Structures are given as structure tokens and as C-alpha cells.
């Protein structure tokens, strides 16, 4: 996260982290006891999921491994459209005060709506610096008509944009799969932007979740 700050402890009980052994790879959210949602470009042969703590390595966090993952069939390794993926935990996550399910959308929020995105991604760029505590930052959703003026062809109806004018507030390396929540429900998952990160007027592109809740619901059942 760039130009943000440490999130208030315990405010993101549905936020998780995908690790390769002990090194941060991406982020994600907990759908339910045995399902994690995240980015499709964060695919791995095996994951070590971190849950129940804003501090990586916390002795009180839950560490669960996952071997199976399901990508949206329409995803593209070239354009990154439909960039979402479901991860199945080898064992059920124990829900507690620090571990809860995210509130999926039932409607799409319009432009202007303020949101918040979090992650353990690098807080600098091009230079690298990975924090141990979860970072937060506020951004506003941008209209498809405005975002196109910036990315043009690089945008499909399933992509959502957010950010603040002339501001570096944004996501970066290691934040993919992280949640963008607005008005209570998950509105998106970090996907892509420009590099170096935090370039002024270069919006962050997310996976608009208000259009994949049916796919998320059917997929879980299918492999339940």
C-alpha cells in the first residue's frame, strides 16, 4: 500500500495472506470456513494462508495450507480480465473474534463512493519495503468513462477503478487479492496498475465483485 497507514487492529477479520513458506505473495479475503477469494494471477501450486492477525508471523494467527484453487474460466493471463480465483483450505478455518467472513455485495456501488483497500504489499516503489503490519488507505471509485481516458483498451466491463486525483494513494506489489470495501460490502479485489506504483492520476484497477457473486456461489457448491 502506498501513502497509507497501519489499519486499526481487529478491523479486518476477513483479510488473509497467501505465503510461500514464510514470504508474502499476495492477499485475499475469507468467504467462509473453507473458502478464500483472491486474484487469479496469484496462482500457486501450494499456499500457506495466514488468518486472524494484522501482523505477519503473529504467534496467535492461524496458518492453514491449501492445495486446490479455482480460477474464473474467463480469466486471461494476458489481459488479466476476470482476475479472480477461489482457494480451498485443506482444513476449515476456525471462526473467532479475529476471523470472520466478508460481506459480499448484493449491489454495485456508483462512482464517488468512498472505499478502503488494505494489504501487506510494499509501501514503496520502485524501491521495495514490506511491512509486518497490515496497511490501509482511502480511495474513491472512478467511473468507467473516466478510467477509460487513462487505460483505454486495457479495460473491460468487469473491471472497477478507484483512487484519488493527483494523489499517490494506491496498491502495489504484494496487494493482489486484497479487498476494496465500500459502504460495508466487498466491492473489489486488487488487480493491476502502473509501475512504479503510486503514479498520480493513474487509478488502481480492481475486480468488480458485484458481478461474480453468482460464480462464487456456484463454484463453492460445485466443489463443496
Kind and range of the H or E element at 10?
Answer: none
CB of 52 to ligand K7I, least distance (A): 22
- The answer to whether the bond into 36 is cis (omega within 30° of 0) is no
Instruction: Check residue 173 for interaction with ligand K7I (CB under 6 A).
Output: yes
Interface with ligand K7I by CB under 6 A: which range of 14-22, 51-59, 166-174, 181-189?
166-174
* 202: Cβ contacts below 8 Å, ≥ 6 apart: 150, 163, 170, 193, 194
Given 53, 72, 83, 125, the catalytic residue: 83
Q: Which is nearer to ligand K7I, 97 or 129 (CB)?
A: 129
Asked if 54 contacts 211 with a C-beta cutoff of 8 angstroms, the reply is: no
Instruction: Check residue 206 for interaction with ligand K7I (CB under 6 A).
Output: no
Of 13, 105, 174, 188, the one binding ligand K7I by CB under 6 A: 174
Instruction: Check residue 172 for interaction with ligand K7I (CB under 6 A).
Output: yes
Instruction: Check residue 41 for interaction with ligand K7I (CB under 6 A).
Output: yes
Of 94, 195, 218, 223, the one binding ligand K7I by CB under 6 A: 195
Quick one: residue 153, left, alpha or beta (phi over 0 = left, psi -120 to 50 = alpha)? alpha
Kind and range of the H or E element at 223?
Answer: none
Q: Which of 39, 44, 126, 36 is nearest to 76 (CA)?
A: 39
Q: Which is nearer to ligand K7I, 26 or 137 (CB)?
A: 26
Name the residue number minimizing CB distance to ligand K7I: 176
Q: How far apart are CA 138 and CA 7, in angstroms?
A: 11
Question: 17: how many CB neighbours lie within 10 A of its CB?
Answer: 27
Contacts to ligand K7I from residues 58-97, by CB under 6 A = 80
Ordered alpha helix ranges (H), 104-209 = 144-151
Establish whether 41 is a catalytic residue.
Answer: yes
Given 53, 69, 158, 176, the catalytic residue: 176
Establish whether 50 is a catalytic residue.
Answer: no
**Residues at the interface with ligand K7I (CB under 6 A):** 26, 39, 41-42, 80, 171-176, 190, 192-193, 195, 197
Active site residues: 41, 83, 176
Amino acid at each position: 500500500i502506498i501513502d497509507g497507514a497501519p489499519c486499526a487492529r481487529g478491523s479486518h477479520p476477513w483479510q488473509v495472506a497467501l505465503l510461500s513458506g514464510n514470504q508474502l505473495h499476495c492477499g485475499g479475503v475469507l468467504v467462509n470456513e473453507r473458502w478464500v477469494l483472491t486474484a487469479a494471477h496469484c496462482k500457486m501450486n501450494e499456499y500457506t494462508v495466514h488468518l486472524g492477525s494484522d501482523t505477519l508471523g503473529d504467534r496467535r494467527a492461524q496458518r492453514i495450507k491449501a492445495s486446490k484453487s479455482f480460477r474464473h474460466p474467463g480469466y486471461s493471463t494476458q489481459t488479466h480480465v476476470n482476475d479472480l480465483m477461489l482457494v480451498k483450505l485443506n482444513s476449515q478455518a476456525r471462526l473467532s473474534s479475529m476471523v470472520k467472513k466478508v460481506r459480499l455485495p448484493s449491489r454495485c456501488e456508483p462512482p464517488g463512493t468512498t472505499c478502503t483497500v488494505s494489504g501487506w504489499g510494499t509501501t514503496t516503489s520502485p524501491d521495495v519495503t514490506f511491512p509486518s503490519d497490515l496497511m490501509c488507505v482511502d480511495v474513491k471509485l472512478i467511473s468507467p468513462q473516466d478510467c477509460t481516458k487513462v487505460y483505454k483498451d486495457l479495460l473491460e466491463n468487469s473491471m472497477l477503478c478507484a483512487g484519488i486525483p493527483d494523489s499517490k494513494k494506491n496498491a502495489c506489489n504484494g496487494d493482489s487479492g486484497g479487498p476494496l470495501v465500500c459502504r460495508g460490502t466487498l466491492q473489489g479485489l486488487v488487480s493491476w496498475g502502473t509501475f512504479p506504483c503510486g503514479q498520480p492520476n493513474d487509478p488502481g484497477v480492481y475486480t468488480q465483485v458485484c458481478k461474480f457473486t453468482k460464480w462464487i456461489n456456484d463454484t463453492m457448491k460445485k466443489h463443496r
